[PDB]
Design a binder for this molecule. Structure first.
Ligand SMILES: Nc1ncnc2c1ncn2[C@@H]1O[C@H](COP(=O)(O)OP(=O)(O)OP(O)(O)=S)[C@@H](O)[C@H]1O
Ligand SMILES: [Mg+2]
Length: 319
C-alpha cells in the first residue's frame, strides 16, 4: 500500500502557514472542533465530511491541509488527480478504493484529493468514459464518508474551481478561499524561506521585500528565495580571491570570497579551501532584488476574477 498514494503523520502547525488567518480559523471550526469535542454534533447538526480549498496556484492549499491534519492529530493520505487521471489511469479505481480503504484503517485521518478539477474537461471516451469511472468511484467512496463512519474527512483542492464537475462540487459541503499572500504573509514567507542562512537583512528589509513582491504567491516567493540562495554558492564558486575574515574569536580561520585587489586577498579557488575554513558570503539586499527582478508573479488578474466569481456564485451555501 504505497506509490501513487502518499501517507504521513504530518507535522505542520498553523504557525508554519503564513497568514491565511481567516482560512485557518474556518478550518478549526470545521475540522478541529468536531474532532476535539465530538458529540457537540448530536442530532441534525452533523460535522462536515467534505471541505474544498480553492484559490489560485501556489497559495498554500496543500501545506494548509497538512497543517489541518497535524492540528487534528491525524494521518494524511493524499492523491494527485493529475497523475491519477493521466499517469495511473490503469489502476485508478483500484487506487481510489485503496485511498479510502487506508483512511478508515488509520482513523482518525484525512484524505487529500489534489486537483479535483482534473476529473472533468469532458469529451467522449478518453476524458468521458475512461475517466468518468474515477469520478464515480470517488463519488461512491464518499457516499461512504457521510455514511459508514466519520473519523475520515475529505479535503479537496483546485486552482480552477470553474472546471469542477458539477456533481463533485456539490459533494464538498463547505468551500474555502485561499488568496494570494498579504504583505504580512509575504514578509514572514521571505523570512521563513531564508531562516538560518547567514544574512545581512533586517526586518525592515524583509518588510520591503514583501512590499516589493505584492501579486507574488507562496510558490513564487519560494522560487525567488531558492534562487536568491544560490548567490553565495555562485560567488564562492567563482573567485579568484579569498580573505580571512575570522575575528580573534573564531575557533578556525574563516576564508570568504572577496574582490581581487583588496586587503588580505590571496588568489585561490574553493578547491583550495579546507572543510572547516570556508565562509559563505551573507545574503545581500542585491541578492534578493536580483532574484525578484527575474521573477514575474505567476498569477495574473484574469485568474483572480474567475476565482472571485466562483466565490460569489458557489462560495457558500450548497451549491
Ligand atoms: N501560507 C504559506 N505559508 C508557508 N509556505 C507557503 C504558503 N503558501 C505557499 N507556501 C509555499 O509554496 C509551496 C507550494 O504551495 P502549496 O502548499 O502546494 O499550496 P497550493 O495552493 O496547492 O500551491 P500549488 O501546490 O502550486 S497549487 C509550499 O509547499 C510552500 O513552500
Ligand atoms: Mg497543491
Amino acid at each position: 500500500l504505497s506509490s501513487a498514494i502518499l501517507s504521513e503523520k504530518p507535522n505542520v502547525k498553523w504557525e508554519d502557514v503564513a497568514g491565511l488567518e481567516g482560512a485557518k480559523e474556518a478550518l478549526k471550526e470545521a475540522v478541529i472542533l468536531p474532532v476535539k469535542f465530538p458529540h457537540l454534533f448530536k442530532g441534525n447538526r452533523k460535522p462536515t465530511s467534505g471541505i474544498l480549498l480553492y484559490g489560485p496556484p501556489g497559495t498554500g492549499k496543500s501545506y494548509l491541509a497538512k497543517a489541518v491534519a497535524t492540528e487534528a492529530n491525524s494521518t494524511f493520505f493524499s492523491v494527485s488527480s493529475s497523475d491519477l487521471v493521466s499517469k495511473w489511469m490503469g489502476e485508478s479505481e483500484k487506487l481510489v478504493k485503496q485511498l479510502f480503504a487506508m483512511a478508515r484503517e488509520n482513523k482518525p485521518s484525512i484524505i487529500f484529493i489534489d486537483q479535483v478539477d482534473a476529473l472533468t474537461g469532458t469529451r467522449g471516451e478518453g476524458e468521458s468514459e475512461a475517466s468518468r469511472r474515477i469520478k464515480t468511484e470517488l463519488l461512491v467512496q464518499m457516499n461512504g464518508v457521510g455514511n459508514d463512519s466519520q473519523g475520515v474527512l475529505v479535503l479537496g483542492a483546485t486552482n480552477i474551481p470553474w472546471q469542477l464537475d458539477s456533481a463533485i462540487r456539490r459533494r464538498f459541503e463547505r468551500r474555502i478561499y485561499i488568496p494570494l499572500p498579504d504583505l504580512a504573509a509575504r514578509t514572514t514567507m521571505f523570512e521563513i524561506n531564508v531562516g538560518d542562512t547567514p544574512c545581512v537583512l533586517t526586518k525592515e528589509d524583509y518588510r520591503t521585500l514583501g512590499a516589493m513582491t505584492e501579486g507574488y504567491s507562496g510558490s513564487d516567493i519560494a522560487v525567488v528565495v531558492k534562487d536568491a540562495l544560490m548567490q553565495p554558492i555562485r560567488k564562492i564558486q567563482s573567485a579568484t580571491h579569498f580573505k580571512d575574515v575570522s575575528t580573534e574569536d573564531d575557533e578556525t580561520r574563516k576564508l570568504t570570497p572577496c574582490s581581487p585587489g583588496d586587503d588580505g586577498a590571496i588568489e585561490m579557488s574553493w578547491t583550495d579551501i579546507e572543510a572547516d575554513e570556508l565562509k559563505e558570503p551573507d545574503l545581500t539586499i542585491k541578492d534578493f532584488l536580483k532574484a525578484i527582478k527575474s521573477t514575474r508573479p505567476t498569477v495574473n488578474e484574469d485568474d483572480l476574477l474567475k476565482q472571485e466569481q466562483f466565490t460569489r456564485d458557489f462560495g457558500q451555501e450548497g451549491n
